[model samples]
Target: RTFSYTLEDHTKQAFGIMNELRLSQQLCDVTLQVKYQDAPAAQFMAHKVVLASSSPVFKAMFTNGLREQGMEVVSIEGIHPKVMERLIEFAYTASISMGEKCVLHVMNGAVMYQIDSVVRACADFLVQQL
Candidate 1:
C-alpha cells in the first residue's frame, strides 16, 4: 500500500558498479599475483577498499602494518590461479561459479580469505553431492 523501492535494487546497482570496475580494471590500486607451484604467476587487478571490505585477510593486509605494508603488488601462493581469480570476482559480485571438480579448491581459497559466503556456497553445493 505504500510507495517504495526495493532495498535490494540499490544493492544490486552498487555491486554492479564494483563488478564493472574489476572487469574494466579501472582505478585499481593493487595487483594480486597467484603463484601456483611450477606454473607462471597470473595477475589480478583489484581495488583495496573492495577487498578490505570483503575479507578480514584483505583488511589486515591493507590496513595493518604487520606484513602487506601497502604494497601495490602481492604474491599469493598455494591457491590455483583460477580459484584466486574467482575469489576476487566473488568479492566484487557476491557470486561465484562452482563445480564438483573444483568446489573443494574454491572452498579452500574462500576459507583462507575468510569469505564466509563463498565458503557456505561451496558447502551447500557439496552437500548436494552427498
Candidate 2:
C-alpha cells in the first residue's frame, strides 16, 4: 500500500528537530503489523503492514519519552482497529501526566513538511509542564 499524508501537517517540524539538534541522519525503519485475534478465524487473520522511517535519535527520544510518562508502547501488530482504539485510549489516559508533549514526537513519522508542526507541538506540550 501507499503511504499518504497532508503537507499542511507537521512534517517540517520533525525534520527541524533533527537539524536543530544535529541528530544523526540515520534512518530507523518501522513496520506496523495490526492483528485482530478476537474475530472469527478467517476475519481475524487480516493484517496490514505499514513501513515507516525516523531518525535514530527521534526513535530513542520518542520511546524514552513514552517510558518516562509510564506509557507502555505495546506492539499491536495485526490488531484490529477496535483493539487499537482501546490501546490508544489507555495510552492517552496514562499519558495525561506527561501532558500533550508526549504526542508530538510520537506522532512524527515519514511525512513531507509536518516536522515543524511536530516540533511545535512538542514545544507546546513541554511548555505546559513549565
Candidate 3:
C-alpha cells in the first residue's frame, strides 16, 4: 500500500491566521498607543501572543515584571504611528515592504522592538543600496 499526503508550511499558515485576526481587529488583547511628542496618539489593536512570538522586547513587556504585564493598553513613545503600524504588521506576518523614504524609520522601530528579522532586512536593504 502506498499513501501520500500533501503538506504545506504550517508556520506560514499560523502566521496568516494571526495576520487575518489583526486585520479584522478580532480577538485582539492589547492596544498599542503610539504617542507623539506633540500630537494626539494613534493606536493599533493587537494580540500579545502574536507580538511576543515575534519580538523579544514585546515578550519581556508582556511576560516579565513590567507595567505592561497586566495592561490592556501600552503606550509606545515618540515613534511615528505609521512606523509603529508597520512594525506590528511585521510582527504578525513576518513580511514587510521596505521603502526608501521610510526604511530608516521602520528599521528604528524594528531595532527598538528587537524584531531581529526586520532589522536584518532593513540592514540588507541599506547595504544593497550602497
Candidate 4:
C-alpha cells in the first residue's frame, strides 16, 4: 500500500510569499553574516528557526552548547556571498535555479552547511541535466 499527500499550487505560492515577506521585513532572530573577498556590501539575513529546521549544522549552532548558540550574527567563511544568498533564499522558499558555472561552488556551500534539501535538489537537477 502507498500513501499520498497533495498540496495545491496556490497554497504553495502563498506560503512562499509569506516566507519571503518575513525575510524582506527582517523578522528574524539571527542573521548569517557572510565574509567573502571583494564582497563588500552583502549579507544573508535569515531566521534561526527556519535555518535550524533545515540543517543539523545550523541546528547545533543555534541550539547546542556552541559559541554560536543563540548568537545574533553568525559569520560564515569560504561560502561566496552569492552562494550564501541562494542558500538563504532556499531556506525561505524551496525554490532555486542553478546556473552552469555556479553548480559546483553553490553545491559545495550547501553541503558544508548540511542544507540537505538544497543539496538533494542541486544534485537531482545536475543529474537530470546530465
Candidate 5:
C-alpha cells in the first residue's frame, strides 16, 4: 500500500478504466492529481476518485464490465445475493493472487443483508413511481 510502484500501478489501471469508459475529463483530472500528489497519500487511492456520471444505466453497465473482468460489484441493488456472494469470493481470491494490496472484508452476514435492504428500497421507491 505504501509502495510507490503499487500505487502507480493502481493509478494507471484506474486511468485505463476511465479512458475505456470514454471519461476523458475524469481521466485527465485523475492523472494530474496523481502526478502532483504525495507518494503514499496520492490520487492512486481508489476511494478518492469520484465517478462523475449520475445515470443508473451507466452505473450498472460499468459495474457489469468490472464483474466480467473478475472484479466484484458490491452495491446492494446490483445483483442477486447468491450470485453477488460468489462474485465477491471470486474477486477476493483473484485479487489476492494478482498482487492486490488490499483485501475486501465483508463482515458477518452483512453482504446479503445489505444487498437485500438496497434491493427492497429500490423496488419500493421505483415501483411506486412506475
Candidate 6:
C-alpha cells in the first residue's frame, strides 16, 4: 500500500496572506456587485491575483476584458444574497460552514464558482455532521 500527504508551511502562508489581502480590501483591482432577483444587492472587493487564480468564473471575466471588466464595479444577478456572501468568504478564507439546511446552497455555489476544494470540504463536513 502507498499513501502520501503533506502540508507545506509556505503554501499555507501564501494563501493566508492572500486571504488577508482580500479581507483588508488591499490593492483589490476588481469589484463585483451581485444581486439576486429580489435579494438585497451587495458588493465585494477581492484581488485579481487571488480570485482569478482561484476560480474560472473570475478569471474569464477579468482576463478576457469583458464589458464589465473596464468598470469600477460589476453587477451580478440571480443568486441569493447569503450564498453570494458565503462565496466571498470562501474565496478569502478557504473555509465554509453551513448546516444541513444551507449545505445544498453552498454546494451549488462551490460548483458554480468552480471552487472544488470547498465542494469537497463542505460535502465531507455535511456527511460527518450527519
- lDDT values for all models: 0.87, 0.34, 0.84, 0.76, 0.31, 0.75
lDDT of 4 by residue, 1-130 (tens): 9898876697668658758766685566777778877777466666777787667899888875544434387778888888888877777677766678798888899999898777887787789886
Give the alpha carbon lDDT tens digit for every residue of 1-130 in model 1. Answer: 7696668588779989988987898888899988998877799989898999899999988885544444499889999999998888888888788666999999999999999988898889889988
In candidate 1, stretches whose alpha carbon ends up further than 4 angstroms from where it belongs are 1-7, 65-71
| Residue-wise C-alpha lDDT for candidate 2, range 66-117, written one tens digit per residue | 3333222333434344433322222222222223533543443212213343
Q: Tell me the spans in candidate 2 whose CA falls farther than 4 Å from its real position.
A: 1-31, 34-101, 104-114
How many pairs collide in each candidate, listed in order? Answer: 0, 19, 0, 0, 0, 0
Candidate 5 local Cα displacement, residue 130, angstroms: 39
Q: In candidate 3, how many Å is residue 5 off?
A: 8.8
Task: Report per-prediction Cα RMSD to one decimal.
Answer: 3.6, 16.1, 3.4, 5.0, 18.2, 5.9
Cα deviation at 48, candidate 5, in Å, is 11
Model 4 steric clash pairs? none
lDDT of 6 by residue, 1-130 (tens): 9999877687778788887877787877778888877766778887776776778887776776454443357677666768877877777676776666888777877788888888887778778876
TM-score of 4: 0.73
Residue 6's lDDT in candidate 6:
77
Off by over 4 Å in 3: 1-7, 65-71
The Cα error of candidate 6 at residue 97, in Å, is: 1.2
Residue 101, model 4: lDDT of 77
Model 3 poorest 10 in a row by lDDT: 62-71
Candidate 2 TM-score, true structure as reference: 0.20
Over 53-100, each residue of candidate 3 has an lDDT whose tens digit, in order, gives 889989888885554444398888978898888888778777787569
TM-score order of candidates, best first?
Answer: 1, 3, 6, 4, 2, 5
- Is 2 or 4 the stronger prediction by TM-score? 4
**lDDT, candidate 5, 1-130, per-residue tens:** 4654346477557545644443323322222122212322222211112322322432444453333432223233423333333323322222211112111222212243343333443445445655
